[PDB]
């Protein structure tokens, strides 16, 4: 299937408390694999997946400086945006960037990402055509004009079509067995009281990877939408994820309800009911 190499960039100013904090966070297909964090006297690019440790002293040296470079670029950038928006010197502000490529299994570029945001709001982004910009306001129009007259789109296009694609291939050969790992969910149902003649059945899914999963409750046939309650999938904090969905059933009727667990690591969906010992 397709794959993606993406970089998540953060620059956070903090007047009279120190230099802005900068981070570059690397992702191959939603797995973080590299991180750089400017909070250190001698900050360094770090591996965040074991398979990245295969890269030599030179790779880290090279990336570290590049990020350091980038950081300084964003320090100016924060100062510049105050100038564009006419904001006072003492506010903390945030620049965020999403940068990278998505490549098909043929090795062609499906789409490219360069999305800028200022204080959690879209600032500028590269269009699907990989040649022009969409600016979200008068301020970004100044950044559009500057990138038009330095042909930034072209330099970016080159990175997307070249460096990005090429390295994503290098990375994939190093960590492919790892990224492909798949942990099926384990499901149980719990039982809980409720005022009077109602009970809560809760369908749990635990110890699964990746995070995509679907939990549904069925009654005698059709599914339970309107009344069902569920929570956002959440990390167990050991690399796995967890989720549950629950439904309020008549006391004595528990056995009439079926929970279905749908996940990619499963030979087939899991079906379970409440089991009173």
């Amino acid at each position: 299937g397709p794959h993606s190499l993406r970089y998540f960039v953060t620059a956070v100013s903090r007047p009279g408390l120190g230099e802005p904090r900068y981070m570059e966070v690397g992702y191959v297909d939603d797995t973080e694999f590299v991180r750089f964090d400017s909070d250190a006297e001698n900050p360094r690019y770090e591996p965040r997946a074991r398979w990245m440790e295969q890269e030599g002293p030179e790779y880290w040296e090279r990336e570290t400086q590049k990020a350091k470079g980038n950081e300084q670029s964003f320090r100016v950038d924060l100062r510049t945006l105050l100038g564009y928006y006419n904001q006072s010197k003492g506010g903390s502000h945030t620049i965020q960037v999403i940068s990278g490529c998505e490549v098909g299994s043929d090795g062609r570029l499906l789409r490219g990402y360069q999305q800028y945001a200022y204080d959690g709001c879209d600032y500028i982004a590269l269009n699907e055509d990989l040649k022009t910009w969409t600016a979200a306001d008068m301020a970004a129009l100044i950044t559009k004009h500057k990138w038009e007259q330095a042909g930034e789109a072209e330099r970016l296009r080159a990175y997307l079509e070249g460096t990005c694609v090429e390295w994503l291939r290098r990375y994939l050969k190093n960590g492919n067995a790892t990224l492909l790992r798949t942990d099926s969910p384990k499901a149980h149902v719990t039982h809980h009281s409720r005022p009077e003649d109602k009970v809560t059945l809760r369908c749990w899914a635990l110890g699964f990877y990746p995070a995509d999963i679907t939990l549904t409750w069925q009654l005698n046939g059709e599914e339970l939408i309107q009344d069902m309650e569920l929570v956002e999938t959440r990390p167990a904090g050991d690399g796995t994820f967890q989720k549950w969905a629950s439904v309020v059933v008549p006391l004595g009727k528990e056995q009439y309800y079926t929970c279905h667990v749908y996940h990619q690591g499963l030979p087939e969906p899991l079906t379970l009911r409440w089991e009173p010992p």
Partner: peptide, 8 residues
């Protein structure tokens, strides 16, 4: 490898 970003 991360892009070498341009100033905005």
């Amino acid at each position: 490898r991360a892009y070498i970003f341009a100033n905005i």
